[PDB]
Amino acid sequence: FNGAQTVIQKISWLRTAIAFLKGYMETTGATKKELEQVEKLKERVDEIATAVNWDVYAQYARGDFNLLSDDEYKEIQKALLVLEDIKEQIIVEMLRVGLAQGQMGTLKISDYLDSLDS
Amino acid sequence: AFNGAQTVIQKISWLRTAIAFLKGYMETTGATKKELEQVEKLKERVDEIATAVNWDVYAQYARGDFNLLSDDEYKEIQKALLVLEDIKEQIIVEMLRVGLAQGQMGTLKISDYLDSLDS
């Protein structure tokens, strides 16, 4: 797998998803608790994001080859996992706040978010 | 000369990845508190402009994924794009200052690598 691209795409999706939620909340006037929960999620993203910055440089440094150590690979995989839990909590938050009411889950929102990243 | 939310996200993401790339290099080579603080001024600039342009992520969606903007909205975005392009050149300057690149050939190879991570 391409380690750096993978983590970057996941962080970018999650940041764009937070921007989306923030905007929906401003336009609809969400509860104080709702804006707190979103803020808590953004902080969880910034924390995990820094844990992987090493790979953004590391990958470039070793001739753009994806030749990582066992320990490095595992830490990237564990970060990828935390990021996927964040995605889950984002979608759950979207649904809880009234986003995607008359929509088949968050399918359209998700497709729109994916479009912004590629 | 933009296309809405996609342009802004792609610009903010490149800037955020370049900062990640700078913090990444500094960890390996070792950095001072002063060396780290100038990277942090850049990160704070990206976070400032990002929050002023975030409304457009939900707004473009709320109108059939069409970049359809009001007068205030369009002017506000024209401003934000100018600041973002300034931060981009500041980061390039930073790449040379910290010794990550020597000349225009090095800054291009790093940007090409950052584009590749984002696209």
Residue numbers in the entry:
A (entry chain A): 2 to 119
B (entry chain B): 1 to 119
Article, verbatim:
Pyrococcus abyssi virus 1 (PAV1) was the first virus particle infecting a hyperthermophilic Euryarchaeota (Pyrococcus abyssi strain GE23) that has been isolated and characterized. We present here the X-ray crystal structure of a putative ORFan protein PAV1-137, to our knowledge the first for a euryarchaeal viral protein. The fold of PAV1-137 is a four-α-helical bundle analogous to those found in some eukaryotic adhesion proteins such as focal adhesion kinase, suggesting that PAV1-137 is involved in protein-protein interactions.
PAV1-137 contains four amphipathic helices that are organized as a helical bundle. The A and B monomers in the asymmetrical unit form a two-fold symmetrical dimer and the symmetry axis runs perpendicular to the direction of the long helices. The dimer interface involves helices 1, 2, and 4. The interface is more hydrophilic than the core of the helical bundle and is stabilized by 9 hydrogen bonds, mainly between side chain and side or main chain atoms.
